[PDB]
Every structure is written in C-alpha cells, then in structure tokens.
Amino acid sequence: KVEEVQTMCDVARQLRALETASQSAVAAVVSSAREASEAKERAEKAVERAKSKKRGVDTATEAAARAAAAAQRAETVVSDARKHAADLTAASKDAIETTDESLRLLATCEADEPIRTAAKKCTGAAAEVTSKSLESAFDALAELLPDGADDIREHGAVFVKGLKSLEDDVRTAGEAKYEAEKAE
Secondary structure: OHHHHHHHHHHHHHHHOHHHHHHHHHHHHHHHHHHHHHHHHHHHHHHHHHHHHOOOHHHHHHHHHHHHHHHHHHHHHHHHHHHHHHHHHHHHHHHHHHHHHHHHHHHOOOOOHHHHHHHHOOOOOOOOOOHHHHHHHHHHHHHHOHHHHHHHHHHHHHHHHHHHHHHHHHHHHHHHHHHHHHHO
16 A cells, blocks of 8 residues: 555665664774874873973873874774674665665556555655654554564664664764864
C-alpha cells in the first residue's frame, strides 16, 4: 500500500545518506585533530620560549604535556573514525541496493498510480541523517509490517550502531581539541 511505499522510501533516503554522513564525520574529526595539533605546537613553542628566558619553564612544560596528550587522543580518533566510516559504508551497500531495487520495481509495477508515483519520486538522499533519524525511519517501517518488525528493527540497528559510533567519534575528537586549546 502507498503508506508502506512512502515509509520504505524514507528508509531508502536515510540509507542513501550514510556515505555522505560518514565522510562528513571523518572530515569533522580530521579538522578537530588538526586544531588540536596546532594547539600542541603553540604550547611546545611556548616551552622553548620559556627555556630561552630561563623562566616559567615548569608551567609551560606542564601545559604542553596536556596539549600534546590531547592532540594524541585526537589523532587516535582520526584512525577510528576512518574505520567506522568504511565499515558503515560497507555494511549498508547491500541494503541500499536491495531497497532501491524494491522501489524501482514498484515504480514500474504492473500497482496503482499513487504507488508507482511514490516509488518513482523516491530519488535522492535525506539530509542530515543521524542515528536518531535513521532509527526512527526503521521503527516506522517496522510498525507497518508486524510479521517482519523484529527483523526490520535489527537490520536497522546495525546502521544505527555504526552511525552512533561515528557520532561518538565526532564528540570524542571535539573534546580532545577543546582540552588541547584549554591547555594552551
């Protein structure tokens, strides 16, 4: 029925948005680690300036140690983020293909007009997909199909988990940048 088609469309738009969301999350983490590293470099220069002066060396050194540790933490997140992004893109490839194929068959289905139309107009990706918008989309689809609902929610849970990981990565790297800058 057309409700189901439109609800499947919402899921498909969420799925189609994951590669862009992943790349966006990685780019955010990379910018954070860059900023953290710049704060580290400022603090390490400040140590040398102190050393030349023969004054204030303890406090500069302690601050630089904090900034350096924070940049190191940020750099670890870059590595984790790239892995989380590539895992999530890999995990969803088959789901995108399958869902798209369901919808393209409905668009040409021997199906009434609103159903062909809802399927045909289902092109493009959602904007600003989050673990929350993705979970909601799968919940909505599960709700229409009680015989298949447990399965649909578990299919979705994979992507919800992977997106939550990248969202945590973004936070973790942002916290590391924030400490690096506060230290310096």
